[PDB]
Amino acid sequence: AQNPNCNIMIFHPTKEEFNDFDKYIAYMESQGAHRAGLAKIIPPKEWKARETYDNISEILIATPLQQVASGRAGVFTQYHKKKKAMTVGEYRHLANSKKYQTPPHQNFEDLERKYWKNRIYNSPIYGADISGSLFDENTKQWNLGHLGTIQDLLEKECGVVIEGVNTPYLYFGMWKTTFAWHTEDMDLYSINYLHLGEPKTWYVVPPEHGQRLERLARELFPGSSRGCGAFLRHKVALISPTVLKENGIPFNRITQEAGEFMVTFPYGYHAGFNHGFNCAEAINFATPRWIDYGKMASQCSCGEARVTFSMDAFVRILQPERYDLWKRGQD
Ligand SMILES: O=C(O)CNC(=O)C(=O)O
Ligand SMILES: [Mg+2]
Ligand code: NI
Ligand SMILES: [Zn+2]
């Protein structure tokens, strides 16, 4: 068995290997990359996402979210308070202001220590889930707006034609902006490209050990667990690496820098934080190996998780027994 310790693997495809996206994901899995839940892909030196980032300031962040924490430093939840619209240029200036800017630090490990010590005492503002793309239309390799759609994959594997679309999303971050512990909708893959700015640190639990994380989360968040049998779908709970180590939960960590791709694999729980002003683009995708994970994915039916139009068909076709309860949660 390849990668039996479930380490995060880093890949350096050549320009030739960067042509066929599906083929390279299958290659990475042949080497055991999915066992970690997360992989890093460094593009060949010949590749670029677009020519420059000099003209992005007029993009609108219609609903910036202030991420307010409750709990203790290593075990907390966050809620998202809606703020007034602002442009990317306005948001960048805010991220760089004395109130929000990255503190002085020695290296990524010192910054990580400062994040876990001090995150809860601040409320950073995140531009999340903005439909759109920063890939040039002429970029033909690993262009996250030109991937094969999940609806086409389901149709190719299973024969059923379904409604829905699959488009990318932009994220504008600042110091301490935080992504809570989660797997993707329907335990899909994700791919994330860091277009510009400061790094993103990731934490990940191997898919084979995801239920260990869920059992810890039920212990640590006992009211939330009573409320919903899949409350991590709400995307609000944080648990630090120190707490994970104290409870014996297997995990790994890695820092993504600008110009790098990360892939999350089906049922790989992940969480993390941004180091400073940055912009990422991400989208979900599927492969044949996903189908069995989609059929088994948990679902939130309490009303909190509320998701895209296109998840309807995935539930309806892969999980018909759960469909009526889940749809009631959507309504
Ligand atoms: O970058 C972020 O805030 C969160 N991204 C992801 O969870 C992802 O790409 O799957
Ligand atoms: Mg612009
Ligand atoms: Ni994710
Ligand atoms: Zn729920």
UniProtKB/Swiss-Prot annotation:
GO terms for molecular function: chromatin DNA binding; damaged DNA binding; histone demethylase activity; histone H3K9 demethylase activity; histone H3K9me2/H3K9me3 demethylase activity; metal ion binding. The modification PolyADP-ribosyl glutamic acid is found at E16, E17. Keywords: ADP-ribosylation, Chromatin regulator, Dioxygenase, Iron, Metal-binding, Nucleus, Oxidoreductase, Transcription, Transcription regulation, Ubl conjugation, Zinc. Its cofactor is Fe(2+). 2-oxoglutarate binds at Y126, N192, K200, K235. Zn(2+) binds at C228, H234, C300, C302. Its main location: nucleus. Binds 1 Fe(2+) ion per subunit. It comes from the Eukaryota. It is found in: Nucleus. Residues 8-50 form the JmjN domain. One of its GO terms (biological process) is double-strand break repair via homologous recombination. Its EC number is 1.14.11.66. Ubiquitinated via 'Lys-63'-linked ubiquitin chains. Deubiquitinated by USP14 with the help of TRIM14 leading to stabilization. Fe cation binds at H182, E184, H270. Residues 136-302 form the JmjC domain. One of its GO terms (cellular component) is site of double-strand break. It catalyses: N(6),N(6),N(6)-trimethyl-L-lysyl(9)-[histone H3] + 2 2-oxoglutarate + 2 O2 = N(6)-methyl-L-lysyl(9)-[histone H3] + 2 formaldehyde + 2 succinate + 2 CO2. Histone demethylase that specifically demethylates 'Lys-9' of histone H3, thereby playing a central role in histone code. Does not demethylate histone H3 'Lys-4', H3 'Lys-27', H3 'Lys-36' nor H4 'Lys-20'. Demethylates both di- and trimethylated H3 'Lys-9' residue, while it has no activity on monomethylated residues. Demethylation of Lys residue generates formaldehyde and succinate. Belongs to the JHDM3 histone demethylase family. This is Lysine-specific demethylase 4D. It comes from Homo sapiens. The chain holds residues 11 to 341 of 523 of the full protein.
